[PDB]
Design a protein around this ligand. Structure first.
Ligand SMILES: *C(=O)CCCCCCCCCCCCC
Ligand SMILES: *C(=O)CCCCCCCCCCCCC
Ligand SMILES: *C(=O)CCCCCCCCCCCCC
Ligand SMILES: *C(=O)CCCCCCCCCCCCC
Ligand SMILES: *C(=O)CCCCCCCCCCCCC
Ligand SMILES: *C(=O)CCCCCCCCCCCCC
Ligand SMILES: [Cl-]
Ligand SMILES: [Cl-]
Ligand SMILES: [Zn+2]
Ligand SMILES: [Zn+2]
Lengths: 29, 21, 29, 21, 29, 21, 29, 21, 29, 29, 21, 21
């Protein structure tokens, strides 16, 4: 599905910003 | 998961911080 | 170095598009 | 690491594939 | 609401580009 | 506001220029 | 239409990444 | 076109490669 | 300096995610 | 030069917003 | 200003919070 | 080219308009 994919593109960008030096693990549905 | 929560409702900076390492 | 930070913001969006359903881990340190 | 390889030299799409789970 | 938030992420990016040296004020609904 | 106009219809470069300083 | 425009913003970013040195031609509907 | 295909279904990296030069 | 311009495009997306409903002002000059 | 690559990722998003329905061609080489 | 502080040194998320209305 | 003009000097929006079809 497309509009879910678009939300992930922003999500990892937002997650990269908020986490910063800590990092994160991104696992989709 | 992260997709199930933040792509259905707006997530605040604290909620995004829960996903960090 | 902010130039380092900017490349990370493009690295995460690259990893998101590349891995897809697999997901990615971002660990600078 | 990924920062020391793909941010000091341009990485093709496959080079990013190495860091997927 | 989410899909409104995503549109804002592009909007400020688009507004930053078009305005440039002038700048802008972004106020949501 | 800006959200009420450009997130309901496509905004042209002139319309975005109305929001600049 | 808006949500079509947003998908294009990601699309050219995704197309720029995947193509790289080759480049691409983006023509909307 | 590209919009008709990838903005209605998810496009894999191979499908995006079809649009390259 | 274009390197300055690129950092602004990431500063605006940072301000958008940080302020949220408050909004932000971008004023380089 | 990765700094070159980063500017391309912002050039494509600029061309997408500028051309709109016209479309754009990205040809570094 | 914001350009002279957060673009010459990496700013944490709180550092961006200073410039919100 | 576009890389040698708009990436070594900041291009206003019209400067990007030159490269549209
Ligand atoms: C992957 O298969 C996505 C699974 C999540 C469900 C997608 C649809 C959820 C219901 C919303 C439909 C609204 C769009 C018509
Ligand atoms: C955490 O600090 C990562 C450790 C390695 C950092 C290397 C940064 C080198 C400085 C940037 C040079 C390249 C600029 C595009
Ligand atoms: C903040 O509360 C947003 C206020 C704007 C209204 C959001 C919904 C507008 C009607 C469209 C619904 C379509 C999605 C199901
Ligand atoms: C330009 O005019 C876009 C043409 C493509 C059709 C847009 C609408 C397609 C049907 C989906 C409607 C769902 C949103 C209410
Ligand atoms: C308007 O021109 C802003 C005034 C201050 C500009 C400072 C730019 C310094 C050159 C960039 C150096 C850092 C590169 C990442
Ligand atoms: C393909 O390689 C393009 C040919 C011209 C490349 C010029 C790159 C110059 C090095 C970057 C200097 C500016 C850094 C912001
Ligand atoms: Cl979107
Ligand atoms: Cl950059
Ligand atoms: Zn989007
Ligand atoms: Zn950048």
């Amino acid at each position: 599905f497309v509009n879910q994919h678009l939300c992930g593109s922003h999500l990892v960008e937002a997650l990269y910003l908020v986490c910063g030096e800590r990092g994160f693990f991104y696992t989709p549905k | 998961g992260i997709v199930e929560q933040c792509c259905t409702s707006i997530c605040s900076l604290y909620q995004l911080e829960n996903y960090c390492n």
